[PDB]
Write an enzyme that holds these catalytic residues in place. Structure first.
Site, mmCIF file in Angstrom:
data_model
loop_
_atom_site.group_PDB
_atom_site.id
_atom_site.type_symbol
_atom_site.label_atom_id
_atom_site.label_comp_id
_atom_site.label_asym_id
_atom_site.label_seq_id
_atom_site.Cartn_x
_atom_site.Cartn_y
_atom_site.Cartn_z
ATOM 1 N N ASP A 98 5.781 2.904 -2.832
ATOM 2 C CA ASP A 98 5.907 3.055 -1.394
ATOM 3 C C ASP A 98 6.897 2.045 -0.824
ATOM 4 O O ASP A 98 7.621 2.337 0.124
ATOM 5 C CB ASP A 98 4.547 2.894 -0.696
ATOM 6 N N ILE A 99 6.841 0.820 -1.336
ATOM 7 C CA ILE A 99 7.708 -0.237 -0.823
ATOM 8 C C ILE A 99 9.184 0.097 -1.038
ATOM 9 O O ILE A 99 9.988 0.048 -0.092
ATOM 10 C CB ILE A 99 7.287 -1.605 -1.424
ATOM 11 N N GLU B 76 10.558 3.052 -1.956
ATOM 12 C CA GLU B 76 10.958 4.430 -1.616
ATOM 13 C C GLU B 76 10.847 4.795 -0.125
ATOM 14 O O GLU B 76 11.488 5.767 0.315
ATOM 15 C CB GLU B 76 10.212 5.444 -2.476
ATOM 16 N N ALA C 72 7.716 -0.829 3.558
ATOM 17 C CA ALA C 72 6.525 -1.244 4.326
ATOM 18 C C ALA C 72 6.846 -1.651 5.764
ATOM 19 O O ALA C 72 5.941 -1.679 6.623
ATOM 20 C CB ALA C 72 5.795 -2.387 3.611
ATOM 21 N N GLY C 73 8.089 -2.059 6.013
ATOM 22 C CA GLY C 73 8.542 -2.309 7.376
ATOM 23 C C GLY C 73 8.788 -1.002 8.113
ATOM 24 O O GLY C 73 8.292 -0.806 9.221
ATOM 25 N N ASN D 53 -0.448 10.139 4.086
ATOM 26 C CA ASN D 53 -1.909 10.227 4.183
ATOM 27 C C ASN D 53 -2.645 8.871 4.227
ATOM 28 O O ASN D 53 -3.728 8.767 4.846
ATOM 29 C CB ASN D 53 -2.496 11.118 3.048
ATOM 30 N N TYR D 54 -2.085 7.840 3.580
ATOM 31 C CA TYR D 54 -2.800 6.557 3.459
ATOM 32 C C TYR D 54 -2.388 5.518 4.485
ATOM 33 O O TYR D 54 -1.235 5.478 4.924
ATOM 34 C CB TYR D 54 -2.623 5.935 2.053
ATOM 35 N N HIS E 168 -6.172 8.465 -9.082
ATOM 36 C CA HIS E 168 -4.887 7.732 -8.969
ATOM 37 C C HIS E 168 -5.190 6.239 -8.944
ATOM 38 O O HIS E 168 -6.342 5.851 -8.698
ATOM 39 C CB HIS E 168 -4.159 8.118 -7.658
HETATM 40 CU CU LIG Z 1 -6.936 5.651 -3.526
#
Ligand SMILES: [Cu+]
Ligand SMILES: [Cu+]
Lengths: 657, 668
Positions: B304-305, B307, B310-311, B389-390, B441
């Site tokens: 995630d960071i 791709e 986080a900013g 989603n998260y 996951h």
């Molecule tokens: Cu999870």
């Protein structure tokens, strides 16, 4: 003249009940000189309680368990008093055990050693004049086990320290020798003296009150501006006597001399369907084994719960500044040696507090304008007990997703022994201050769960994360990413004897194989998630391993039987560890069924402590935690009917053009 | 004219500096059609920074790193702008990578797939008529890696869902197929369609707003009584721009598009001796590898960071309260595709709060009348970002015993895929609701520590609790209770590649071998205490293990070099995992020295998630934590000069109430 019955069958004995019990026992032993060691509730049979609670059964009889000593007789006598009839209904003499050491038992030892001529002579040799014995102190420990005397006398060992001034913390100044005290005769019978003598430290004491810190570093920090936490409209929990209702949980808060807090009859109200979770949960034993092999340090492996009692040692919480907000307190009642009721005021603190976010989700589609956020509240049931140098802060925590957590904070003072000017502490200890050796040790705890997961007939299992066994590039696992959770249900006691494993991130389930979650198809469970699970470092066959057979595995699961509480046995001090009792008896040959029956789940957890100077002269709180969380118990997140702290739907966001 | 210099060399680019940088780049590429992917501070070289800070050196030059696309060119160009001279000073074209997916890159995918004839036809086959395409939604993911296209096109995959009403949570209704979208052409180029078709669920959506819950369970609970937090005399911390001072800690709070929060130049003021602890600490990458082997689910392993950032993903924290108490906020500034500055208000929240007991001790001898107790305060610097989603809630926590903790809470919604009526979800997933398969996951994170423990020249070690090797009954170990801590100092990179071990309760030290604690005789250290350390479950040589070479070990220690930030490489999307970059490059042949030098310490931690119905339709917060605690760093508890909340000495207690030549215990 029978004492009044309690509100609830699991309530601890009232002061009136304790007095009734001791009156009854004194009469039964008419003309004998006896002293009371333990007078405590004997809890109803599990079946009897459950039938009373759920099937309109009869109230179980109120019973008192007692342990006494008799002048001139070895060991103890124990038995039961039926409180309604003021009669002793069961009795037996145990001539070869020694019982829990009470506050009175331990409060007597300093006067014994200060006045003993052989101790005085050792102080003189150690550089303390004979007329300064008022400056010599000791922490009175269980002897633990010493093979020179077995259980043939009731013994303490005095870990001796020096104070230059009564306000000093004595732990920078241990002396080199260890007096052995006959508790019942009140004399020193022997003194362990090391081959290499080390005289009292000439350093200043390592002190920690503000007046001392001002001398040490020049000034205290300015008082910080206050962070005020208020509940101006009160709390959401409701207590009815000892019964708690909060966020759909309902349970009984009990307390006794040994285990301290005992949580019973824990259920969750699932939208009108009241579902049992646990019949009983408590800490049932501890062991704090030290790691210096040098004599007599092998005798430091306190089993604090069984040898002193987490109730007996508990702090009154009034002035303790750890029960903030709108709170509810409970008192504890014990017997003294004379058989009179004694009270610890505000032994248990109950309060609710903010616990961060419970859940949140926002939709990126409208830049998070569609958003729901709900804050968590936790309910905390806590005590703090003091075991000579150490403080154990115990927090039983209920959460709004239906989980239950035990949080422990360890603080207080390192146990210390003297270190010579030129002596190396390592590898068994750390020099945390000049002439001070803080020995390595573990703190291990035995959590005892009597489950009733969604009702009767339970099982347990180990759950291990595993890669697929099919290799990378197979049709079954083409890109190598497949993984699953391997569940090993324990069929017999032997199968359950298992350790935490980092390699599989192991967890354990306690589950009801008679029921199935209508969504997932799995049985309703609570899962133990616990990673602070040290191996027992003492060898197989050691004194430590023998006296704490439970501590060798992270998990032990045995059949339920009434009165299976204490896994190092009922009378712990001075047991050698030889014999079939406690967890060793319950495990037996390992062959008994524990699948789909009434089971007992004992979990070993804790820490391994290699002291450092940051821990001295007063140790910052060290955390330990484990959680029991519902998995396949509910069909959805059970907190979703809690009002959100903020909520905006998509339609609402659009409407706010 | 050049933009004003910041207060501090580590301050993030201002909106003025962002505009200056993109003006400068547009001019350099005069007449070309370009778009801005990233415009961010290029932090000063460590040595230059330290020379400036400590040795009278010159202010490092203020530099902006940029990544741009150019219409009709493959890949990206990147470079550096010197902001004082408004010139491009470094430039290069990377035709065969793909860069971080920005909010704008992602925002148009849902309308692309709604309007694609081939996608509409699949919806129709799935039971959703063409006139209901407005009910079809997707989460736009990077494709991750798909060996059919490599980095030759810039691709997203659309995880498709259906809402009966716009207020539904769509995750109870995934569809069965997966459109692949060309990001720059805004078109569907392929659709992965499964062998076994599963038409859309006919069940009610699993919803979670109050109006939904009232229909589902009949009513909401009563509003609970408030718990209020006030600080009527203000806060104990002091901020000077981005520089924080609190309880003897001093450090700089930075923020960027990728890592989110970055803590720099952390020191502790030990009664006048200002001692460095870390030069830089942040999260440098993540990977969230899903565990279903069925195609195309291997493509769910978001980093995630690297791709999305986080900013870039971070939530404005004004409206929860996300963050509770008396708050200091920081905003974040980025560039959009046009090169204009954009602002996320209240990206970072800073506050102090009660954190239980700091320490306590009472003396049994007078029934605990002799007692001292001091309550703890913690300082929290936090953000929350949403990755489709998260939700990831990140809390950097400073403590009054000198320890630093990272706490993470995961919440938001399970990723779901469709499950047929008679289809078993296991063993790769759980049926959390009818027709819903929530796949297994892991969530794994790479914490990057650039240490400066009590100054320069550091080492790292694993610390393992061991029984004595001498047997029960030997003179050395008579009662069999002896045990010690075995410290293994890493000499070369290869030595450091280590996992958490329950069998020894393993911890890791980062320490300064040039110095010694005068009491214990050990070097000053911070010890990493971290048990949420899953093995990487994906196999050696898998896509997951190749794209995240750091995730294979709990600890990786490599030599410091400038610009070694991102362990899956600088441009992560669509990298196959082949090649010597990121952590693989820094490890090299494993032979480089990491003992008593400038090192970088990358720690992999996180959780393995096997979903259950309790997690659905919205998941209760799941915690993760690690701690870095001083051990042999101080010579005594550093919190002892904090005013106690209560204290009474033995002499005070005696005054409060007014064998044997000598008396025994008071309580006797
Ligand atoms: Cu999870
Ligand atoms: Cu300890």
């Amino acid at each position: 003249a029978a004492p009044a019955r309690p509100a609830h069958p699991l309530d601890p004995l009232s002061t009136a009940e304790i007095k009734a019990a001791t009156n009854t026992v004194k009469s039964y032993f008419a003309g004998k000189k006896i002293s009371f060691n333990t007078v405590t509730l004997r809890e109803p049979a599990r079946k009897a309680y459950i039938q009373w609670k759920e099937q309109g059964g009869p109230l179980p009889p109120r019973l008192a368990y007692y342990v006494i000593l008799e002048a001139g007789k070895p060991g103890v006598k124990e038995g039961l008093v039926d409180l309604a009839s003021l009669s002793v209904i069961e009795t037996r003499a145990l001539e070869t055990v020694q019982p829990i050491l009470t506050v009175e038992d331990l409060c007597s030892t300093e006067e014994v050693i200060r006045n003993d001529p052989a101790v005085i002579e050792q102080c003189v040799l150690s550089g303390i004049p004979a007329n300064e014995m008022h400056k010599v102190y000791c922490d009175p420990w269980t002897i633990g086990y010493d093979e020179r005397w077995g259980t043939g006398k009731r013994l303490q060992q005095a870990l001796v320290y020096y104070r230059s001034d009564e306000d000093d913390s004595q732990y920078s100044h241990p002396l080199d020798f260890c007096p052995i005290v006959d508790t019942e005769e009140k004399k020193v019978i022997f003194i362990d003296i090391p081959n290499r003598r080390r005289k009292v430290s000439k350093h200043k004491h390592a002190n920690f009150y503000p007046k001392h810190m001002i001398e040490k570093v020049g000034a205290m920090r300015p008082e910080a501006p206050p962070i005020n936490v208020t509940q101006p409209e009160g709390v959401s929990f409701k207590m009815t006597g000892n019964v708690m209702e909060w966020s759909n949980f309902k349970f009984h808060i009990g307390f006794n001399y040994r285990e301290g807090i005992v949580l019973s009859d824990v259920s969750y109200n699932d939208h009108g369907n009241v579902r049992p979770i646990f019949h009983r949960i408590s800490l049932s034993e501890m062991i704090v084994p030290y790691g210096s092999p040098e004599f007599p340090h092998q005798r430091k492996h306190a089993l604090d719960i069984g040898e002193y009692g987490a109730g007996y040692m508990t702090n009154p919480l009034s002035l303790g500044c750890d029960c903030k907000g709108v709170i509810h307190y409970l008192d504890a009642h014990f017997s003294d040696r004379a058989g009179d009721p004694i009270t610890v005021k505000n032994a248990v603190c109950i309060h609710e507090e903010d616990d961060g976010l419970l859940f949140k989700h926002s939709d990126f589609r409208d830049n998070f304008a569609t958003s729901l956020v709900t804050r968590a509240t936790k309910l905390v049931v806590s005590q703090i007990f003091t075991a000579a140098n150490y403080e154990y802060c115990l927090y039983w925590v209920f959460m709004q997703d239906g989980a239950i957590r035990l949080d422990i904070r360890l603080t207080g003072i390192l146990n210390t022994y003297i270190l010579g000017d030129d002596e190396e502490a390592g590898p068994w200890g750390t020099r945390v201050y000049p002439n001070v050796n803080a020995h390595n040790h573990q703190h291990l705890f035995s959590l005892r769960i009597d489950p009733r997961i969604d009702g009767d007939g339970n099982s347990a299992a180990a759950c291990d994360a595993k890669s697929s066994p099919y290799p990378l590039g197979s049709p079954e696992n083409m890109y190598g990413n497949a993984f699953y959770s391997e569940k090993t249900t324990f069929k017999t006691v032997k199968d359950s004897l298992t350790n935490y494993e980092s390699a599989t991130g192991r967890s354990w389930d306690i589950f009801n194989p008679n029921k199935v979650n209508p969504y997932s198809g799995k049985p309703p469970s609570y899962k133990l998630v616990s990673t602070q699970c040290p191996p027992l470092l003492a060898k197989e066959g050691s004194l430590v391993a023998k006296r704490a057979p439970w501590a060798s595995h992270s998990v032990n699961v045995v059949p339920y039987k009434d009165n299976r509480l204490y896994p190092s046995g009922d009378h712990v001090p001075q047991w050698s560890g030889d014999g079939v009792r406690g967890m060793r008896e319950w495990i037996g040959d390992g062959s008994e069924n524990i699948d789909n029956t009434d089971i007992l789940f004992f979990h070993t957890f804790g820490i391994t402590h290699f002291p450092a100077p940051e821990d001295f002269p007063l140790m910052p709180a060290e955390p330990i935690t484990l959680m029991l969380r519902p998995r396949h118990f509910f069909t959805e997140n059970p907190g979703l009917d809690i009002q959100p702290s903020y909520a905006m739907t998509t339609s609402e966001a659009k409407r706010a053009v």
